[PDB]
Design a protein around this ligand. Sequence first.
Ligand code: IRH
Length: 238
Amino acid sequence: ILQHPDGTVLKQLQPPPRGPRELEFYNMVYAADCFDGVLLELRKYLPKYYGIWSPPTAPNDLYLKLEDVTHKFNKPCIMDVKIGQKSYDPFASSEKIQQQVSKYPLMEEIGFLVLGMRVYHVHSDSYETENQHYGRSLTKETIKDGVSRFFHNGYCLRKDAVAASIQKIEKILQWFENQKQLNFYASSLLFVYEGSSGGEVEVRMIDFAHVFPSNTIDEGYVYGLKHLISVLRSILDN
Ligand SMILES: COc1cc(-c2oc3cc(O)cc(O)c3c(=O)c2O)ccc1O
C-alpha cells in the first residue's frame, strides 16, 4: 500500500489470478450503471474506489486507486483482521488448502486472524507494531487479550473505541445477513481509531482477491464477525 498525501492510496495488483480478481470485484461493486441494492449498500463499507491507475510512463504497472481510510485521523491506531473460517477459496487445490490452513490452523475454530496492528502510545509519543506472527500465535485462551492490546492507548483501555467497533461491525454483519450473492475468503476488516491526545472509529472491508459468486449466506464470514463481536463485547467487561 502506497500512501499518498491527497488522501488516497495505491494498492498494487497482486500477481494473477489474485490482482485481476480484485480489480474485477471493485469494478463490479462500483459500476456506474449498477442499481443492485446489495452492491450499492456494500459501497458504504469499502474504501471509495477511483478506478484502475498506472504510472504515466508504465501502463504495465497496475494499481487500484483507493480512499485512504486513515486520512482523517491525527495519530491513527490501525488493526487489520482477516475474517472467516476458511482462508482458501472454493477452487483451491489440496496443496493450496493445506498451505492456507497451515498458515493458521485455528481459523476454523476462531473465525478471524489478526494480521497486524499499529498502536499509538501517548506516554512515549510512539507506535508499537505487531506483525503477522503476533496474530498467528493467538489461541482460544489468548485471543481476548490479543485483541485487547489494540485498544491500550491514552493511559487506559479504550472501551469507547471497542464499543464503536462493535456498532460498526454490526452494520457489516447486517449486510451479510441480507445478501446471498457473494462469498468472501481471505478478506479483512481494517479498524482505525484516533490515538492522539472519543467513540470515533473506522471499520472497512478490504482485500478482495478471493470473492466469488454464491447462492448462500457467507456462513464462515458471519461466524467470524459474530465471534469477533463477542470477543470485543467481553473486552467491555474488563
Ligand atoms: C498507516 O498505514 C497503514 C495504511 C493501511 C491502509 O490499508 C489499506 C488496504 C487496502 O486494501 C485498502 C485501503 O484503502 C487501505 C487504506 O486506506 C489504508 O490506509 C493499512 C495499514 C497501515 O499501517
